[PDB]
Design an enzyme around this catalytic site. Structure first.
Site, PDB file in Angstrom:
ATOM      1  N   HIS A   1      23.096 -29.508   1.360  1.00  0.00           N
ATOM      2  CA  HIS A   1      22.091 -28.506   1.622  1.00  0.00           C
ATOM      3  C   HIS A   1      22.547 -27.755   3.153  1.00  0.00           C
ATOM      4  CE1 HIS A   1      20.508 -30.469  -1.850  1.00  0.00           C
ATOM      5  NE2 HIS A   1      19.280 -30.102  -1.615  1.00  0.00           N
TER       6      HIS A   1
ATOM      7  N   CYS B   1      14.600 -33.826   1.790  1.00  0.00           N
ATOM      8  CA  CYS B   1      14.594 -32.501   2.203  1.00  0.00           C
ATOM      9  C   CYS B   1      14.181 -31.489   1.152  1.00  0.00           C
ATOM     10  CB  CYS B   1      16.162 -32.346   2.368  1.00  0.00           C
ATOM     11  SG  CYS B   1      16.927 -30.816   3.155  1.00  0.00           S
ATOM     12  N   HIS B   2      14.816 -31.600   0.011  1.00  0.00           N
ATOM     13  CA  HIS B   2      14.078 -30.978  -1.351  1.00  0.00           C
ATOM     14  C   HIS B   2      13.602 -32.033  -2.172  1.00  0.00           C
ATOM     15  CE1 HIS B   2      16.620 -26.957  -0.697  1.00  0.00           C
ATOM     16  NE2 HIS B   2      16.424 -27.296   0.435  1.00  0.00           N
ATOM     17  N   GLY B   3      14.742 -32.806  -2.675  1.00  0.00           N
ATOM     18  CA  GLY B   3      14.480 -34.005  -3.751  1.00  0.00           C
ATOM     19  C   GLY B   3      15.743 -34.454  -4.148  1.00  0.00           C
TER      20      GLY B   3
END
Ligand SMILES: CCCCCCCCCCC(=O)OC[C@H](COP(=O)(O)OC[C@H](O)COP(=O)(O)OC[C@@H](COC(=O)CC)OC(=O)CCC)OC(=O)CCCCCCCC
Ligand SMILES: CCCCCCCCCCC(=O)OC[C@H](COP(=O)(O)OC[C@H](O)COP(=O)(O)OC[C@@H](COC(=O)CC)OC(=O)CCC)OC(=O)CCCCCCCC
Ligand SMILES: CCCCCCCCCCCCCCCCCC(=O)OC[C@H](COP(=O)(O)OCCN)OC(=O)CCCCCCCCCCCCC
Ligand code: HEM
Ligand code: HEM
Ligand code: HEM
Ligand code: HEM
Ligand SMILES: COc1c(O)c(C)c(C/C=C(/C)CC/C=C(\C)CC/C=C(\C)CC/C=C(\C)CC/C=C(\C)CCC=C(C)C)c(O)c1OC
Ligand SMILES: COc1c(O)c(C)c(C/C=C(/C)CC/C=C(\C)CC/C=C(\C)CC/C=C(\C)CC/C=C(\C)CCC=C(C)C)c(O)c1OC
Ligand SMILES: CCCCCCCCCCCCCCC(=O)OCCCOP(=O)(O)OC[C@@H](O)COP(=O)(O)OCCCOC(C)=O
Ligand SMILES: CCCCCCCCCCCCCCCCCC(=O)O[C@H](COC(=O)CCCCCC)COP(=O)(O)OCCN
Ligand code: FES
Lengths: 123, 385, 126, 54, 93, 248, 55, 50, 93
Positions: free
Chosen positions: A69, A88-90
């Site tokens: 990312h 962070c996002h998943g």
């Protein structure tokens, strides 16, 4: 290219050594690894890969943290399988270190560490 | 003759700032280029005096900037005047460039002056980036990480130029020590491009808001445009002083007061506010190599503008359609900078793909088509066959 | 830098067409009144840029009675904009006076420069 | 009259400008520091130091 | 040095324009004029004429781009709410 | 993102140092250092603040010397080369509780407490966020959220799960001047003390800013008058045309 | 005329190092000033490449 | 130590010379100090502490 | 720009010397000449003439300053010897 030792990191640990300037994920082992690392069908995934392609020195494991990312950092010591956790996002990189779900497209890199006896060189 | 005309050194000063012939009708938009010369003098002077107290080692860099702000006498004035001075330097340059884009200052015979300006703009983006890394905060480590890793996508020479920029295998102590030494130099290269820039202005002079010849009505520079330039100098200092003394951390990011940590990543990594429109253009293309090419192409597309303007009239003063579309391009540039400070989420991905098409379409499609239409509209309105 | 030969090529096709000259001529008359050069005391041929050889040739050949009147209109215009005002409504240029006084001198300078280039890079019939 | 001595030369007037700027700084500072400290009286250290002297 | 290429501008005495004949100019000293009688009847009556001539070429573009920004926000507000969880799941993949 | 992942918006309280002509309240700084020494300093460092900077701000010189003398620092080794210790002095920096980051995490279940010398400037919200964080712990989390073991709910923290627990309860300190030491009162003092640690120049910065703005605003108005005077000949200039007779 | 005489930037180079009139009888003692220009270029270049490693 | 390889000694000889000394490692998981043997990147140690 | 003050040098075509009349010049191409016939009969016969003309203006000063340097050394050698200890004690104070 560093070599701490081989009986210096016990079983249920890990150390993110600053090896060559990176968050790299040391992991000491037991045959208690091919148990359960591929008890899942590969094609339920972004696009897969196999244990024998992964690493064939299979009782000391190391993997990068340079995430695709912008450089996120996973867990130490938690989860359902026992994997590595992206807030962070998943994502949760399972015991083998792969997708369960997320927008993460691919798993990174197992640093090209070669075995010759008495020391394993990371890098 | 007078001594200011016969002496080798005063003759240059007289020809440029005393007796230079100027058009009488130029307005206050022609005062931005003198301000940019004051900005460069501010930035260079304040930097020499801070460099006497700075340390560029990666374990000493962050704590050296706090030593400047706590222990150095009048050190907080030097820094904040420096950090807010660069934001004011970039805002006056966007207004300078948009001026020349409105009044047609890029057209012949002033194509060479416009090309040396595009080179100054490239060197000023580079300078500001290198100095933001000398702080070594949390935005300063991770901004250098993601920008230097873009040159890894160049085929067959990518992984070699990145290890050569870094001096190793990551953003490390060799990286910060060389960025500071590059950062002191490039301001002196900008000063030599400014001299070449003024030399190209002297052979034809300045234009005027009507877009016709100015050789019929000229007044000298001394005591008409010296005292008109003095009006905007004291407004510039007044607005800058208001930000340095009463609101000195509103144009920066809070996370840069955290020291750099390679193991902890921030939740949102963004540049300063003046590189955000170009950060959203890179983020629009879903491919590493093509996004890097498109980011740089957004700066070099200014060079095709002397060739795609197909008008016989200079400037937008008497042009209805080309005035409406000049302001679509301005507010599209503000939405790009605003998209670049958002998360990668729906619908901010499509909004940035349409708005980056309107940036490239203005220079290459819209201008040559409406300029041809306006020529023919002037012809048939008068000639009655 | 579209040539004037090309502008008139397109324009005379529109004007001599019945159906085309009734949708684009009313549009072009409002385009000229919204531009506002007639309120500064200017004709359109004064606005043309003159930093090129085809326009320097046309201005040398302009008669001097018309050349002296052009310089006064340009000086009066720089002074009217300097003050941020417009001229009185009885000193504006009217539509009868907004004539192309310089177009014919331009078209003959263009037809001669094109004739020269076609001869300087010709290939022979033999 | 007034103009033949106030500013006729500019050795009259660059010396009066410079000499008058030196006197301006001192008079200007004392007036600002007195207004600033009186606008925020009760919050400064010298007022706190005069309330704990028991 | 030698002369360089000729230009479209000269200097005082030879500026490169057309020849002038029949134009006369007049002026008055600043010392003889009343102080600054040009600020008022210029900041209200003239400044309004200048505003009304040009404000339409700025505010129609500004209205287009600001309306497009608010409809993008409010839709993003909605997708990450409890009511907009089902639509978020579709428009992602 | 979701509102729980960004955190709750800290409201806007009326601090007495807000405004362009206002200074710090120096009785709250002194009162706020007492809350640092008795509550926070067990698990937080202040490594960028020296003892000497407190003189003339919150304490007298004789008071500060007695506070530094209660700690031990490393002196230079004796005549044989063995290490020495000594008491503290004014040039020394305020010491922290832990010797290294390994020991700090070992006492807080893996979490690291940050240094607080710049926490007001390094967070979005400033003084309004530090205050609302400390007075914002609810006594039971909302229905549905499942906390991990060893974490507490605070809706002002991004995510809603923070490793710190509540540490402010009523009347845990007794102030010298006799102010009631409630929860909101102790919070207002530490946040005022910690802003001084981030901005020690705050008071004299806004005094030199009053002089600069008054001088430059007067020069800007004098510049307008001078320019209009010197431009009056050009603005009122007149022109007239008489066509020459056609014989030239 | 030639391009090196009409261009704004090449005209300076032409007037100084190409077409500049010189006396025919000057000897090798008149060559020290060009060397001093090379010395300054050597020092500025080498010092900048060392400054990347200095503390 | 590494500068002696290829000049005066082989790589295997130099590793055995460095291993006979003790250097300071980074602390353990609780924060206490550690020691370790020498490696090639280390510098030749001196006899006196100060 | 305007013209500057006049000088004692111009450019090609107008250099500022006196007017020439009655001088004729001849030359030959380098390609038509034999390679470098000017090194020898110049490094021995001419170089010796140039040396003999000017060596006296350099070597009489050099002889004066070098003789003065050696007599200063040898005297300093002597003062800090065992034989020159009594003279060192006087010329100091
Ligand atoms: C940080 C640096 C600060 C300085 C930067 C800005 C300075 C350049 C902006 C150009 C400008 O002056 O704005 C005018 C613009 C277009 O209009 P124009 O070019 O036809 O007329 C010009 C005429 O000479 C005025 O000047 P005027 O001839 O009317 O009178 C003199 C005036 C002096 O005011 C100033 O100092 C202006 C800087 O007298 C007074 O105001 C007395 C005070 C009571 O119309 C506007 O009002 C637009 C405002 C600017 C908005 C764009 C920027 C926002 C990001
Ligand atoms: C330490 C850093 C130094 C580095 C830079 C070195 C450069 C130092 C140059 C100093 C100088 O300018 O002295 C010049 C002087 C010659 O004066 P001139 O023009 O009348 O001679 C033209 C020649 O006959 C034609 O010589 P030609 O043009 O044919 O070839 C030149 C070639 C030598 O050719 C030969 O094989 C022998 C003839 O190369 C050179 O000579 C290189 C130049 C030294 O030289 C002499 O021979 C006599 C003066 C002696 C100077 C000694 C004192 C200085 C310390
Ligand atoms: C790669 C680099 C890209 C650079 C793009 C950067 C874009 C941001 C730059 C901001 C400054 C842009 C302002 C436009 C300046 C160009 C000159 C100009 O517009 O002035 C002429 C215009 C016409 O009005 P006048 O009455 O003055 O008539 C004189 C000639 N017709 O007079 C006017 O000024 C019009 C009235 C004022 C308009 C103000 C609207 C807001 C402009 C944008 C500001 C920034 C966002 C708010
Ligand atoms: C065109 C001229 C310049 C520009 C645009 C520029 C820009 C910048 C910027 C944006 C920063 C980061 C500000 C912050 O957030 O703290 C910075 C930092 C710095 N710059 Fe400059 N700079 C310029 C000239 C110079 C020069 C010539 C020097 C040295 C002589 C210098 C020395 C420094 C130093 C020491 C820092 C770190 C201290 C700090 O953070 O303020 N700068 N520069
Ligand atoms: C340090 C940066 C710069 C400085 C100091 C500078 C300086 C100047 C000055 C003094 C003028 C004359 C006065 C004026 O027109 O306002 C000028 C004009 C001009 N500049 Fe710049 N400039 C800079 C950057 C740029 C840039 C980035 C561009 C375009 C990309 C540019 C393009 C022009 C043009 C086209 C003109 C002529 C405008 C006209 O005569 O109508 N300059 N510059
Ligand atoms: C002995 C008492 C205290 C202990 C044991 C303690 C412990 C901690 C811990 C473990 C964290 C890390 C939070 C996380 O990573 O989730 C933390 C953060 C923090 N603490 Fe404390 N703390 C104490 C007292 C205080 C006090 C009284 C204050 C306020 C004056 C304070 C201010 C902060 C702040 C501002 C943060 C960071 C919050 C953020 O980053 O959003 N601490 N503390
Ligand atoms: C006219 C130009 C210069 C002169 C005459 C000059 C002279 C000198 C001298 C004599 C030394 C000491 C040499 C030694 O004994 O080690 C030195 C050191 C140094 N100079 Fe320069 N210098 C010049 C330009 C520069 C520049 C532009 C830099 C740019 C950073 C630079 C960087 C350094 C550094 C880093 C050192 C210390 C390293 C060393 O000792 O070599 N110099 N300089
Ligand atoms: C259109 O009409 C114009 C016109 O209006 C103007 C304004 C100009 C002039 C415009 C400019 C922008 C001027 C150019 C300015 C520069 C190129 C700036 C370059 C110079 C500097 C930045 C100064 C550098 C400073 C130093 C080297 C010294 C700083 C350090 C110090 C003082 C520390 C010294 C150490 C100790 C211990 C005291 C024109 O040329 C012109 O054309 C005719
Ligand atoms: C009499 O006849 C003559 C005549 O014979 C000569 C020779 C000349 C010309 C004489 C000269 C001496 C030339 C002038 C030379 C200078 C002014 C030297 C200037 C040197 C510089 C400005 C240095 C430039 C160096 C750099 C920019 C370094 C680049 C470094 C890089 C890219 C490293 C990157 C890494 C970092 C950290 C920056 C005459 O003008 C002349 O008169 C007619
Ligand atoms: C090898 C080729 C070159 C060799 C030597 C070339 C010498 C350069 C100029 C000599 C010729 C002068 C005569 C006129 C001419 O044809 O040349 C124009 C000269 C350059 O003009 P300018 O300096 O850009 O003016 C620009 C003006 O603004 C006056 O300049 P200013 O802003 O005062 O600059 C000082 C700022 C920084 O200068 C520094 C530090 O270098
Ligand atoms: C004191 C500071 C030094 C000042 C300069 C003196 C030293 C000279 C600098 C070195 C000379 C190199 C100049 C390049 C020559 C070609 C210039 C040219 O072609 O002019 C321009 C094009 O140049 C450019 O695009 C920008 C130049 C980039 C400058 C590179 C740094 C051509 O313009 P032209 O003269 O042909 O007329 C207009 C016709 N369309
Ligand atoms: S960071 Fe690995 S999935 Fe989000």
């Amino acid at each position: 290219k560093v070599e701490v030792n081989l009986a210096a990191i016990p079983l249920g640990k890990n150390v993110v050594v600053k090896w060559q300037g990176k968050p790299v994920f040391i992991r000491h082992r037991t045959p208690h690894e091919i148990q359960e690392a591929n008890s899942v069908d590969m094609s339920a995934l972004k696009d897969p890969q196999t244990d024998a392609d992964r690493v064939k020195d299979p009782q000391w494991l190391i993997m990068l943290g340079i995430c695709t990312h912008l450089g996120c950092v996973p867990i130490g010591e938690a989860g359902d399988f026992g994997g590595w956790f992206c807030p962070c996002h998943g994502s949760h990189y399972d015991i083998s270190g792969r997708i369960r779900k997320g927008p993460a497209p691919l798993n990174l890199e197992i640093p090209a560490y070669e075995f010759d006896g008495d020391k394993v060189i990371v890098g | 003759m007078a001594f200011r005309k016969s002496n080798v050194y005063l003759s240059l000063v007289n020809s440029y700032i005393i007796d230079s012939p100027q058009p009488s009708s130029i307005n206050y938009w022609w005062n931005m280029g003198s301000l940019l010369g004051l900005c460069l003098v501010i930035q260079i002077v304040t930097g020499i005096f801070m460099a006497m107290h700075y340390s560029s080692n990666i374990e000493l860099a962050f704590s050296s900037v706090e030593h400047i702000m706590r222990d150095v006498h009048n050190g907080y004035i030097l820094r904040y005047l420096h950090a807010n001075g660069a934001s004011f330097f970039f805002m006056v340059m966007f207004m300078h460039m948009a001026k020349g884009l409105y009044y047609g200052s890029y057209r012949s015979p002033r194509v060479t002056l416009w090309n040396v300006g595009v080179i100054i703009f490239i060197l000023t983006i580079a300078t500001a980036f290198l100095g933001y890394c000398c702080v070594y905060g949390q935005m300063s480590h991770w901004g250098a990480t993601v920008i230097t890793n873009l040159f890894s996508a160049i085929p067959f020479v990518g992984n070699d130029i990145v290890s050569w920029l870094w001096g190793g295998f990551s953003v490390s102590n060799p990286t910060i020590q060389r960025f500071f030494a590059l950062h002191y130099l490039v301001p002196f290269i900008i000063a030599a491009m400014v001299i070449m820039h003024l030399m190209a202005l002297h052979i034809h002079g300045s234009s005027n808001p009507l877009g016709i010849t100015g050789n019929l009505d000229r007044i000298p520079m001394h005591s008409y445009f010296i005292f008109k330039d003095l009006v905007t100098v004291f407004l510039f200092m007044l607005i800058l002083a208001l930000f340095v003394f009463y609101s000195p951390n509103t144009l920066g990011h809070p996370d840069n007061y955290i020291p750099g940590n390679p193991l902890v990543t921030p939740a949102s990594i963004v540049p300063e506010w003046y590189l955000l429109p170009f950060y959203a253009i890179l983020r629009s293309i879903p491919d590493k190599l093509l996004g890097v090419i498109t980011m740089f192409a957004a700066i070099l597309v200014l060079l095709v503008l002397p060739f795609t303007d197909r008008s016989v009239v200079r400037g937008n003063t008497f042009k209805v359609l080309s005035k409406f579309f000049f302001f679509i391009f301005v507010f599209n540039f503000v939405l790009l900078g605003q998209i670049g400070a958002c998360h990668v989420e729906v619908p901010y991905v499509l909004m940035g793909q349409i708005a980056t098409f309107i940036y490239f379409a203005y220079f290459l499609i819209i201008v040559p088509v409406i300029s041809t239409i306006e020529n023919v509209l002037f012809y048939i309105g008068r000639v009655n066959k | 830098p579209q040539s004037f030969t090309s502008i008139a090529r397109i324009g005379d096709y529109i004007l001599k067409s019945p159906v085309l000259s009734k949708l684009c001529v009313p549009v072009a008359n409002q385009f000229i009144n919204l531009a506002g050069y007639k309120k500064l005391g200017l004709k359109f041929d004064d606005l043309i840029a003159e930093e090129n050889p085809i326009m320097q040739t046309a201005l040398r050949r302009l008669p001097e009675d018309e050349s002296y009147a052009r310089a006064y209109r340009i000086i009066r215009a720089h002074q009217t904009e300097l003050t941020h005002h417009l001229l009185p409504r009885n000193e504006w240029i009217k539509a009868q006076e907004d004539v192309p006084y310089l177009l014919p001198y331009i078209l003959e300078a263009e037809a001669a420069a094109k004739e020269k280039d076609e001869l300087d890079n010709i290939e022979v019939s033999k | 009259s007034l103009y033949k001595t106030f500013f006729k030369r500019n050795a009259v007037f660059v010396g009066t400008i410079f000499a008058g700027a030196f006197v301006f700084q001192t008079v200007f500072d004392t007036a600002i520091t007195s207004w600033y400290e009186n606008h925020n009286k009760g919050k400064l250290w010298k007022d706190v130091k005069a309330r704990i002297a028991a | 040095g030698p002369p360089s290429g000729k230009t479209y501008m000269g200097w005082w005495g030879h500026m490169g324009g057309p020849k002038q004949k029949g134009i006369t100019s007049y002026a008055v000293s600043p010392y003889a004029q009343k102080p600054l009688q040009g600020i008022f009847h210029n900041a209200v009556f003239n400044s309004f004429r200048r505003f009304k001539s040009q404000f339409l070429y700025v505010l129609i573009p500004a209205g287009i781009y600001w309306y497009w920004w608010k409809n993008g926000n409010e839709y993003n507000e909605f997708l990450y709410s409890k009511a907009g969880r089902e639509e978020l799941e579709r428009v992602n993949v | 993102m979701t509102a729980a992942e960004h955190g709750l918006h800290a409201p806007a309280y009326a601090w007495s140092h807000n405004g362009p002509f206002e200074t710090f309240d120096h009785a709250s700084i002194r009162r706020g250092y007492q809350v640092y020494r008795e509550v926070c300093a067990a698990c937080h460092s202040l490594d960028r603040v020296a003892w000497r900077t407190l003189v003339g701000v919150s304490h007298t010189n004789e008071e500060v010397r007695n506070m530094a003398e209660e700690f031990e620092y490393d002196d230079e080794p004796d005549e044989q080369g063995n290490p020495k210790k000594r008491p503290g002095k004014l040039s020394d920096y305020i010491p922290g509780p832990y010797p290294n980051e390994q020991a700090a995490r070992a006492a807080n279940q893996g979490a690291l407490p940050p240094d607080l010398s710049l926490i007001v400037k390094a967070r979005h919200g400033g003084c309004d966020y530090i205050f609302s964080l400390l007075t914002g712990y609810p006594d039971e989390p909302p229905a549905g959220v499942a906390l991990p073991p060893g974490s507490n709910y605070n809706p002002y923290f991004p995510g809603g799960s923070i490793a710190m627990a509540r540490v402010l309860f009523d009347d845990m300190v007794e102030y010298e001047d006799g102010t009631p030491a409630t929860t909101s009162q102790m919070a207002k003092d530490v946040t005022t003390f910690l802003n001084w640690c981030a901005e020690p120049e705050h008071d004299e910065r806004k005094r030199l800013g009053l002089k600069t703005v008054i001088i430059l605003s007067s020069l800007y108005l004098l510049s307008i008058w001078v320019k209009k005077f010197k431009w009056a000949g050009i603005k009122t200039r007149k022109f007239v045309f008489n066509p020459p007779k056609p014989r030239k």
